[PDB]
Design a protein around this ligand. Structure first.
Ligand SMILES: [Br-]
Ligand SMILES: [Br-]
Lengths: 425, 425
């Protein structure tokens, strides 16, 4: 049921988003540590670095919002909604505006230390690339939907080095028609594999955090994850309800408050980046902090509360964000602390407290997004671990069932409804 | 978008097909080794075991065809087509006939040493159970399609201890409507997880063949798997073309030749089982032979050809089969032999020859079935290995692309057209 010209077209897509997605992370992290290095050169005398790192990170986030509007307010926030909508009819996609602004803007946002979120810019930039190439390749109407849907999944793979995830993204959440070329899967796979290959060439080839050795997970240890699910289920429910309210508060003007909204929220995050803790930035560092570097059970709770608020305060403000990675650090910090405690009560059933630290790593995403299958893979692909599956599933799907048992609604569909409601911006 | 009464029903589904699916394999393997032990008890003097093992395996397959019609000719062959049809409209499904016949018949077939194929019975029985508990739960119209689609995916999972495969099965090949309850995924995941948890309870918990240590796969080693895909692409093309033509031969009577077809084909396999070599039986043993027990490069090609024919001969005859496992054993033998040879020409790009042996393990399935995503997941879940991914993807989707580049068509969709053509049996 497959058609050649398109497959080779997806090969072009994944290749572009790979170079841009990988090239993006490197460019951002270089700016991240450059500020951190500027903070220690001025650190000695005195808190002059307290000022300089505030003017920089503040001016970066401020110039981030200004380049958003007026230029292309379509880049605000995540990236899944804007493409999830275009793929379905509502909301237009223009690449010559999204591509060069979601990039030059997203860089100033993530580069200042905001609580996001590579998979944000890369997924939209990738969808735009899928359109840019679709126009270059003069493909049909249904085929150019595929190229954009491919560039979307590739954008995810190019952020977490996870192909199967970017594939399962389109497959579960953001479910498209594809009529009747249901073999656009082939176009996806192609687009993703190529993306991660270009990724692994620039900064590969290993995963995000390979916890490959932990493989002792007994059968009578699963009951704990039902509870790890219920915990993350209500966690997702409160994450959504909160985000929505922070969005409201930000939507409520005033005209002079938004003038400074960027400079303020940015400089405040600029200071918070100076404290030796993973309380700011994308969220990868926060996952590389639950595990492995052992810290106080109190400090976990300290950072968990720190980020859980700062992400909502960040994304709600409507900066060029990305909500996947932040929900990975927030979830991991918890799952690790929950891990310690369950091993504390029952060590005879959780011999390795890292198993439960992996299972509930993408359980927040699973709950808030209603999309467990695409979360379960995301974890497997950044830990190279599959032995954690039976836990992973139960703690990810029970995490979703519960959140929508309290009635939370998929954070992206509701995030889309709100971006639709700006049919006059 | 999820509805509780259905999720809790899927729990019942997978749990039942789990108990049956596992209880099925063990009950079959018990008959496999029982005959093999009877063969060695009478082995000493003389070839009297040559006669006994022929009568038994011949009388089983003959009894298997007899219980097929008149009773439930719907249980003939695989199980994907029948359910793929009922799920789409054409062809009816009645559990009170399929369940008990596909079981007692499948036990006699696989228990005799036929070239199949647990996923056959377990998937169709799983579909039957999904329907049986669909009436018990008085589910709606669309919900009972889900319950049957779940039981199907669980059937696969129960056979290979691979949840993510049974989930990707329904998702890619055998793509259903689900309108607009696209979150039947939660019903699938649930059904698969439960099944494998019941599976691991009875015969778990480890995979089929764990090859978790091989994790060195360079980026400039990929080009080989393109070529490994080209090889399987043509291998699948001929596997389909062949199967179809073997089927024609069997469909062409005579009315007196079919009277003995069951006894003749069965006793022939009964003799072949006695040879110390994995050329009969499901195909698991075949995969558990490529790796690990090292045997002559010549013996590989001797077994490969032997099985490649014996499978078509066993399935084309319209016996209660299952074509996944047989296609795995064949592919593995080939992928290993191709591995040795590639490591022979370039060791500085295939340090570990087992890496390539894993990639093209499910590339025969990928090519023949047009379903790469489900194959890629099937392999990962039976090797506990994710490091093989980039090869696994390239070698599996290029295995499929080539297959339908020579235009082979999905072996299941065509298998469905042929069972449709029997709208008069
Ligand atoms: Br996102
Ligand atoms: Br099958």
């Amino acid at each position: 049921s497959l058609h050649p010209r398109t497959l080779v077209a997806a090969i072009v897509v994944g290749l572009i988003t790979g170079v841009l997605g990988a090239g993006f992370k490197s460019a951002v992290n270089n700016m991240l540590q450059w500020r951190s290095q500027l903070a220690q050169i001025l650190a000695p005398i005195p808190p002059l670095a307290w000022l300089v790192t505030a003017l920089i990170s503040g001016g970066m986030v401020a110039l981030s919002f200004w380049l958003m509007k007026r230029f292309a307010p379509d880049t605000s926030g995540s990236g899944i909604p804007q493409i999830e909508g275009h793929l379905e009819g509502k909301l237009p996609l223009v690449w010559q505006r999204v591509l060069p602004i979601k990039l030059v803007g997203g860089f100033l946002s993530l580069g200042a230390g905001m609580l996001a979120g590579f998979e944000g810019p890369t997924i939209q930039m990738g969808g735009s690339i899928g359109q840019m190439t679709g126009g270059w390749f003069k493909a049909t109407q249904e085929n150019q939907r595929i190229l954009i849907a491919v560039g979307a999944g590739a954008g995810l793979a190019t952020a977490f080095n996870a192909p199967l995830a970017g594939v399962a993204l389109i497959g579960e959440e953001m479910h498209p028609r594809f009529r009747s070329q249901t073999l656009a899967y082939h176009s996806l796979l192609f687009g993703c594999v190529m993306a991660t290959i270009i990724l692994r060439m620039i900064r590969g080839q290993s995963a995000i955090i390979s916890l490959t050795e932990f493989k002792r997970v007994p059968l009578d240890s699963l009951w704990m994850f039902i509870i790890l699910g219920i915990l993350f289920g209500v966690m997702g429910y409160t994450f959504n309800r909160g985000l929505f309210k922070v969005l409201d508060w930000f939507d409520r003007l005033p005209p002079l408050a938004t003038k400074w909204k960027g400079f303020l929220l940015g400089s405040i995050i600029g200071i918070l980046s100076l404290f030796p803790l993973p309380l700011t930035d994308g969220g990868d560092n926060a996952v590389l902090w639950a595990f492995n570097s052992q810290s106080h059970f109190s400090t976990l709770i300290l950072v968990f509360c720190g980020r859980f608020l700062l992400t909502l305060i960040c994304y709600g403000s409507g900066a060029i964000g990305g909500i996947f990675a932040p929900m990975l650090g927030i979830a991991s910090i918890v799952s690790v602390a929950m891990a310690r405690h369950f091993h504390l009560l029952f060590p005879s059933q959780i011999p390795e407290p890292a198993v439960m630290a992996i299972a509930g790593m993408g359980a927040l995403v699973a709950a808030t997004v209603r999309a467990p299958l695409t979360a379960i893979l995301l974890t497997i692909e950044m830990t190279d671990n599959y032995f954690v599956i039976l836990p992973l599933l139960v703690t990810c799907l029970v995490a979703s069932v519960v959140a929508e048992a309290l009635g939370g609604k998929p954070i992206y569909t509701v995030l889309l409804e709100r971006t639709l409601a700006k049919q006059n911006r």
